[PDB]
Design an enzyme around this catalytic site. Sequence first.
Site, PDB file in Angstrom:
ATOM      1  N   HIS A  41       1.129  -1.399   0.204  1.00  0.00           N
ATOM      2  CA  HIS A  41      -0.053  -0.253   0.374  1.00  0.00           C
ATOM      3  C   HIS A  41       0.833   1.159  -0.154  1.00  0.00           C
ATOM      4  O   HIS A  41       0.358   2.903   0.191  1.00  0.00           O
ATOM      5  CB  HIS A  41      -0.930  -0.228   1.505  1.00  0.00           C
ATOM      6  CG  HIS A  41      -0.615   0.059   2.624  1.00  0.00           C
ATOM      7  ND1 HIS A  41       0.227   1.166   2.750  1.00  0.00           N
ATOM      8  CD2 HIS A  41      -1.327  -0.672   3.444  1.00  0.00           C
ATOM      9  CE1 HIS A  41       0.683   1.043   4.017  1.00  0.00           C
ATOM     10  NE2 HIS A  41      -0.158  -0.474   4.749  1.00  0.00           N
ATOM     11  N   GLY A 143       2.430   6.256   9.857  1.00  0.00           N
ATOM     12  CA  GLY A 143       3.791   6.243   9.381  1.00  0.00           C
ATOM     13  C   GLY A 143       4.155   4.764   9.839  1.00  0.00           C
ATOM     14  O   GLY A 143       4.995   4.630  10.069  1.00  0.00           O
ATOM     15  N   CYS A 145       3.589   1.636   9.533  1.00  0.00           N
ATOM     16  CA  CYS A 145       3.432   0.673   8.125  1.00  0.00           C
ATOM     17  C   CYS A 145       4.618   0.482   7.696  1.00  0.00           C
ATOM     18  O   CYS A 145       5.934   1.381   8.067  1.00  0.00           O
ATOM     19  CB  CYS A 145       2.297   1.062   7.400  1.00  0.00           C
ATOM     20  SG  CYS A 145       0.461   1.870   8.087  1.00  0.00           S
TER      21      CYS A 145
HETATM   22  C1  P6I Z   1      -1.523   4.438   1.793  1.00  0.00           C
HETATM   23  S1  P6I Z   1      -2.345   5.066   2.237  1.00  0.00           S
HETATM   24  C2  P6I Z   1      -2.918   5.139   3.515  1.00  0.00           C
HETATM   25  C3  P6I Z   1      -3.803   5.337   4.831  1.00  0.00           C
HETATM   26  C4  P6I Z   1      -4.702   5.084   5.502  1.00  0.00           C
HETATM   27  C5  P6I Z   1      -3.756   3.237   6.310  1.00  0.00           C
HETATM   28  N1  P6I Z   1      -4.437   2.170   6.796  1.00  0.00           N
HETATM   29  C6  P6I Z   1      -6.142   2.128   6.634  1.00  0.00           C
HETATM   30  C7  P6I Z   1      -5.890   0.769   5.481  1.00  0.00           C
HETATM   31  C8  P6I Z   1      -4.442   0.166   6.119  1.00  0.00           C
HETATM   32  C9  P6I Z   1      -4.807  -0.675   5.422  1.00  0.00           C
HETATM   33 CL1  P6I Z   1      -3.585  -2.193   4.868  1.00  0.00          CL
HETATM   34  C10 P6I Z   1      -6.433  -0.936   4.581  1.00  0.00           C
HETATM   35  S2  P6I Z   1      -7.711  -0.038   5.325  1.00  0.00           S
HETATM   36  C11 P6I Z   1      -4.570   2.568   8.179  1.00  0.00           C
HETATM   37  O1  P6I Z   1      -5.090   1.217   9.284  1.00  0.00           O
HETATM   38  C12 P6I Z   1      -2.823   2.660   8.296  1.00  0.00           C
HETATM   39  C13 P6I Z   1      -2.796   3.452   9.573  1.00  0.00           C
HETATM   40  C14 P6I Z   1      -1.862   2.123  10.505  1.00  0.00           C
HETATM   41  N2  P6I Z   1      -1.188   1.771  11.840  1.00  0.00           N
HETATM   42  C15 P6I Z   1      -1.749   2.809  13.192  1.00  0.00           C
HETATM   43  C16 P6I Z   1      -2.897   3.948  12.414  1.00  0.00           C
HETATM   44  C17 P6I Z   1      -3.221   4.821  12.847  1.00  0.00           C
HETATM   45  C18 P6I Z   1      -3.731   5.834  12.605  1.00  0.00           C
HETATM   46  C19 P6I Z   1      -3.907   5.843  11.075  1.00  0.00           C
HETATM   47  C20 P6I Z   1      -3.589   4.534  10.225  1.00  0.00           C
HETATM   48  C21 P6I Z   1      -2.645   3.590  10.773  1.00  0.00           C
HETATM   49  C22 P6I Z   1      -2.896   2.876   5.429  1.00  0.00           C
HETATM   50  C23 P6I Z   1      -2.231   3.473   3.832  1.00  0.00           C
END
Ligand code: P6I
EC number: 3.4.19.12
Lengths: 305, 305
Positions: A41, A143, A145
């Site tokens: 992603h 961030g 990820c």
């Molecule tokens: C490239 S753009 C992007 C935008 C949002 C995220 N998301 C939503 C999703 C990930 C997946 Cl796999 C499916 S939906 C996350 O869950 C990422 C996150 C992770 N860990 C903690 C997080 C805490 C707050 C917000 C997002 C978090 C991924 C990439």
Amino acid sequence: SGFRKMAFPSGKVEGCMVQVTCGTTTLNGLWLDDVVYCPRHVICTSEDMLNPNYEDLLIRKSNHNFLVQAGNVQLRVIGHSMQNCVLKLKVDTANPKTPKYKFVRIQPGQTFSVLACYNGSPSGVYQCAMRPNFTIKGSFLNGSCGSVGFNIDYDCVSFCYMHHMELPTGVHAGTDLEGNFYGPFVDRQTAQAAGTDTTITVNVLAWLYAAVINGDRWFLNRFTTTLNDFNLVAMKYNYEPLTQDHVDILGPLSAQTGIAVLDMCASLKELLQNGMNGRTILGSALLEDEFTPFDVVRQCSGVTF
Amino acid sequence: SGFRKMAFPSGKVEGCMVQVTCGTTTLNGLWLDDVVYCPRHVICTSEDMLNPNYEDLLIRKSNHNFLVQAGNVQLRVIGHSMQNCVLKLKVDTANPKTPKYKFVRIQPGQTFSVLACYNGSPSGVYQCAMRPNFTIKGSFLNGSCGSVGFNIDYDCVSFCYMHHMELPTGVHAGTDLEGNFYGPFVDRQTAQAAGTDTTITVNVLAWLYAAVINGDRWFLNRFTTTLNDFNLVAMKYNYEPLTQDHVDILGPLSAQTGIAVLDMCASLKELLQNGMNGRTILGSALLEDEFTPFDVVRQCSGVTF
Ligand SMILES: CSc1ccc(N(Cc2cc(Cl)cs2)C(=O)Cc2cncc3ccccc23)cc1
Ligand SMILES: CSc1ccc(N(Cc2cc(Cl)cs2)C(=O)Cc2cncc3ccccc23)cc1
């Protein structure tokens, strides 16, 4: 003596963390030999996450669309492929700090250390269990990820987790390093939920053994139980079934403390029926299920790396 | 989101751990530049420990009585001095892995990471608070002596703790890296006891702010309190006094959440009166007091190293 939630020392994994940027998206990658592993992603915008076609998004990208920063050093991407939900970026330089490592897929109940990273830089390390509902109770902001989970056995890092997602309940989901999700989750921004979780029975027993080793025995009793009678009670409290394999795994702790596994099961049966009656075990008011039998032996006998 | 007891990444400290042997006694040393720091009781037998004269025990030793092992490399000791309760062994080679570092003495309530080591090898990392009674609730077996506690600010390791002793209650005592004990403890096998411990009030408040930042406000109420009425109540639960300095330190978290410090104090008062009634706060059935206000901001805003 004493009992703490204890992470593996993070040094071997710190040497592997890099920053990966594709367009406006920056996250963490794992640099081993001449490959950087990150969530696929990374090639998505927030808009793309609603309904991404990864094959289509990826084929429109060249090597030079991927900026990999090791810390101060720009790594050149010379190749890319997708394996399940992870992107593999081939780079021009092998990581000189590459530890002895394997990729392992863990089972529910197994614990690992997370090195939580932002922009390829570690912010901290904590211990997690893979829940029976294939989520982890982590600490992750946007961030994070590409942050990884791992165990260390002697000098060998076993990478078991890469962080992808936070679910609406505030728990976390990701993949093994081959990009296969733990649990029935997809890398799309669609309605998804943690399933009903259960308690990791074998881990609660390991922790009761930890309590005994550390001089807390108020909960022991003169009763025994069959495995089957134990499971008939425990099931009613949303406890995972205890298998003969679980009983065997608890052998070393049973031998060390002189408490038979089925006797500890009788103790747990009583605790589930009666509660704590205002008492605590190893400084917790709850029955802790995020220590494996191995975690207890390792900590209570001082095994090093 | 999520909130976990999180250690600093341990890599910079792992590069500094060595094994120190004097006769039959082996423990851990900290190798920075061309000096190895270890507990001065390395020069004692178990017999010596009742009432050792360290000046007298030390003057009888030559450089070659001290075996320092950095993994597979023998370091040659070319000198020694005693500073309070730490031995400084001058060695022939500077540690090439020496990080930017300083020695700091922390206050009660302040947290740090412990890298638990045996035989100069790290077994694991966990987060500790200096208790108000100048003990730590650690996890340490025999051989852990010389394990260090530290904070990281960017690339600078602040060493604040060296492990010396376990007290009869199973809590732990040691020194700063200048060899000055935290608390009234002495490096003799004489009867010594942890004083009555208290709860680190400013830390419990920080953690309630952590719970709010993470989306949980069930424990809030419509009330406020004077600082003095707060302290009169909290004292009855064996909570440390909250000072105006504590209130000021909580300013940033209060501003972020829009909850006045004295309003959070009113919430804590009610939690002490009512308990949880079968709820949890950030996965705990107890009020957690081993996160500082800085620990909460650092973890909730994703500071890296
Ligand atoms: C490239 S753009 C992007 C935008 C949002 C995220 N998301 C939503 C999703 C990930 C997946 Cl796999 C499916 S939906 C996350 O869950 C990422 C996150 C992770 N860990 C903690 C997080 C805490 C707050 C917000 C997002 C978090 C991924 C990439
Ligand atoms: C040289 S020989 C030697 C033998 C025993 C210990 N002691 C007792 C004392 C330390 C101090 Cl300072 C005064 S008495 C310890 O407390 C060492 C230990 C530490 N941490 C955890 C421990 C757990 C179990 C046993 C000993 C532990 C010191 C040196």
